[model samples]
Target: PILNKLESLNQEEAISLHVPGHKNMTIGHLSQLSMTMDKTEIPGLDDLHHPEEVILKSMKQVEKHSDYDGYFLVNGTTSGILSVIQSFSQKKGDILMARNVHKSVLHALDISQQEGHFIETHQSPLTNHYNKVNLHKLVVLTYPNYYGETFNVEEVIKSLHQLNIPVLIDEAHGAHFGLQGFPDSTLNYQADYVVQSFHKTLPALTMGSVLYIHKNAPYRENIIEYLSYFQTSSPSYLIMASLESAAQFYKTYDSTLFFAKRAQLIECLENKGFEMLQVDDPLKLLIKYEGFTGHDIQNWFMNAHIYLELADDYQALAILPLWHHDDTYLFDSLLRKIEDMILPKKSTQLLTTEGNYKPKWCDLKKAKGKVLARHIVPYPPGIPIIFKGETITENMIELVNEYLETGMIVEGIKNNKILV
Candidate 1:
């Protein structure tokens, strides 16, 4: 049933503005490989856990793209984050992280049992998404946020570096950054450790990610050791191959076709009543319509077989792929779908929350002035608003309640209640 559903969806010829950056296998060499390429570590094949022969050379190809030592992450950016955080914590006692650090970073704190102090970040007034990062030992930061916008990241990194603080950056949605005309990657600032999901913005297989360890990082060896423990023993050859190919693609990428197609797409969307917001990264776009909510427009696009990346009440995010001059995409199809889409009927009834409502947890509306037992995280960006053991303020309640009203998926919210 699952396989059939996937195959059927593939047959739909959906316009993907989402992930696996291959864009339904239309932009990359991944489609060139057959099932025969899905082999394991045989005689000639070297191990990913302990790369030496083929695996080492394959990873070396990626290293040529930057000065930072690169490692192939079949387990995605999560494992790289785990290794980096745990490695730093093993050396130092506690970590100072950004408030908008990914959920994986929180998990790393739990698994490592290290204390993490979050420095409240600056929120974007328009998008409501976080834009930037803090102290103790290793400072973990998120650059160019999920919306691919950066604010004072260079200044932050430079200032932190002056204090001799090792910085680890989660540049998950910014793999395409630093490629030709794109925004500069956190690697450019020499962050001690930077993790990138190659599949997010590059033509790579799903779960394809990379960890860049700066030459001067103190715990590079330890990070590698932990990576071996966290990553799978039987890594996917296909994913690794795609990572290699994607890295090569990044090195020699040209933005001529991408910019041209982007402008054309923008013009079409604007004519079709869509308002676009381009941030620092040209690959990511935030789109809005005057009357319709983000969720409503998202549903409209879904019915038209055009999938967007993420959506809030305000806007929907679209991730554009790195289009090579020779590559072809269904831009006309996307435009046509946008033209013919039907907007959802808005609900006149206003949303409300209950004040009265646990055992160890309680209703989020009643959570005000209470202590949080777990993380109340908003998905897509996956940042926690109310962290475990923290005091739930009125502001936190308002934030999450507003999110719930807009049909946004807020994690740690179960049946309108949260761990108190």
Candidate 2:
């Protein structure tokens, strides 16, 4: 299994400079919790296929915490997305989606053979247009997206409701937003379907997630039936336990204290001459250095034993978390090191329309009226610069070329090459 590969790779923990940075070399508090809870389905444990006791109780607690009709997933938010898609759109129809959606949704489209109408955020309008049209089909969107910016989900839902169209939200990164002062939960926004990656923002094991179906959703019973099939029959009890723990953690945990620490971290970075990218979430720290490319800064940070969650030509993102509650020392050390680094005299010129390498419109030859084979995106933001079914223009090419020239890791393109 992939987890086994991960375990083997971390066995010789060489200062974990990669993902799930739990540093498998040592036994941490969470590791102890994982160890204590690792057990297979047995007598009092009740089969996940037909959870009558413990599993059901845990799910109930999750529903109560999130204020939604509940379902637990061990296969991550992908399963939740799949379950919702299958439940709602079993009969294939058109889907309206934000261009920046995770690839999992793309896979769902392929599987369902559902046509998609892509919507781009107003700020990033080169990829797709977000013009509101008379509602004709289902709409899926990401709330508090990967970079921590949120759309007015409530307003969007109200608009869709007027047309009697269902809205499915891929709220994978905003599971923690339901707590007091964070953004209002998309669950509370009356979306027909919502998927939350509990592990992304909450203190849950990786792959733990939740699916929320509002009480007023159409075909709710059928959706629940499909969910049972979409999820694994033998769900991981450990994952379920982690979800339960996370739900409880969010219910009583002091969130103000956590946000205060995050604020301090941001302030320290700003005080040290790093330009902080403005965003709604305090947990995401995007910093860029003057003169040096984001890639350059990323290399320097890696050499300094400070690894970031994401980096590209333009930005490096440090993901802070309430889960990192005990790791304040690490953040402090990083701040000190960053402060000591030499500051460039001036900030690098941000790539804009006036740059020598500006985007120009282009035309397709034989590819006319065909679906795009791949997505072109920068790594740090991972928002698609180009999406499937969108016409590629010369301007798109120029923007992509500029990004490539800067040595930014571009994703989802064929052979790292753009086709006109």
Candidate 3:
């Protein structure tokens, strides 16, 4: 039923965008694909990799939304991330990045052996910001952590640019920014490369995202080349169209309805004693309790069937009211649900932390530190504790117990032992 909205776009007489060759109609056997809105890069459909007509226009269409040149992302933000990094960064070097990067950025580094100059990030656990950007050719940053927090983006970008460096902002959670009266979109600051997971906060399909290349960015061509590398040769027309619909969702969205609901939600949350922290995006509901950690309130919300976006020992993050096209098929019931709820009382215990036990080796002395095999990650998501030829340092071994100590299902790691 949710997909039916997309299905309806296949109007009886509406012309197709050119891909799939089916034209959204059944000429013969292609009818099967049409029913499902599946199309290929036939002719007029326009290739996402090398856009000309519709696809090219789609990229350009972001102008109405943001000032930057935009490209649709079918594989979510990961591939776009790889593209951004590859576009400006050399094959090997430590580009500066905030320590709390998404795991995908780390994967890009592993493939390219691009090391990082990780600028220290917020340690008090109250803020999600970097100390500063040291020198680097390309700098990567997450605008609003999963919690939807941000800093003086323009100031940060200005500082980086003065160093003659380009910045890549991972604004996955702040996709809804740039809306009238909302916090300034990162694009306003003239960032070099900006990637947004539109689907993360917008009403798009799960994998729909967008990569923006400021018109003046020097690595524009390279961004395209790298996007092809990480993307599937055959992209789904459905998801691609969802990207369009995401734009449509943006185009036709009612900011008044959107902001009204969020104000109500934030007010209720704040009144419930969920102290609201400072955030750039008004839509992000990052909170900390007077007595409970995110881990504890998380379980309370979980029991209430309120699935939060992310929660750590320090804070809990909630995505705000979705500017959805249709609520009939969504968890729009969240409104009524919250209205009926009693704010959870402070609990004494904290909820625990996910993981696979597969590791390539064992080295105890080195592992004796915090980094353990199949165990808890010491610092991060770029905090990326992957096994893709990224080395296992000795200090990590000592932290294996931390991994075993946490996690709801580490038992699956039966002997998830570690050796440095």
Q: After superposition, how far is residue 153 of candidate 2 from its true place, in Å?
A: 1.6
Cα lDDT tens digits, model 1, 1-420, are: 999989988899888999989998877667666778999989999998888999899887887346688999999999999999887655654577776678888788878777666665666755777665422577778876888888767788788789878888998988888777787887777788889999988999999999999887888788899989999888899999999989888888888888988898898888777889878888888998887767777887888999999787778889986787666668778888877766544341111111110112698778777867777677544555656755676867777888889887888999999886
Ranking by lDDT: 1, 2, 3
lDDT for each candidate structure = 0.79, 0.64, 0.61
TM-score of 1: 0.87
If scored against the real structure, what TM-score would every candidate get?
Answer: 0.87, 0.78, 0.72
Worst 10 residues of 3 by lDDT: 348-357
CA error at residue 89 for candidate 2, angstroms: 3.7
Q: How far is candidate 2 from the true structure (C-alpha RMSD, Å)?
A: 6.3
Tell how far residue 88 is off in model 3, in angstroms: 5.0
Model 2: CA > 4 A from native: 1-32, 64-67, 124-135, 323-329, 342-366, 378-382, 389-420
- For model 1, what is the C-alpha lDDT against the true structure? 0.79
The regions of model 3 sitting more than 4 angstroms off are: 1-35, 64-67, 88-93, 124-135, 270-275, 287-293, 324-336, 342-419
**In terms of TM-score, which candidate is strongest?**
1
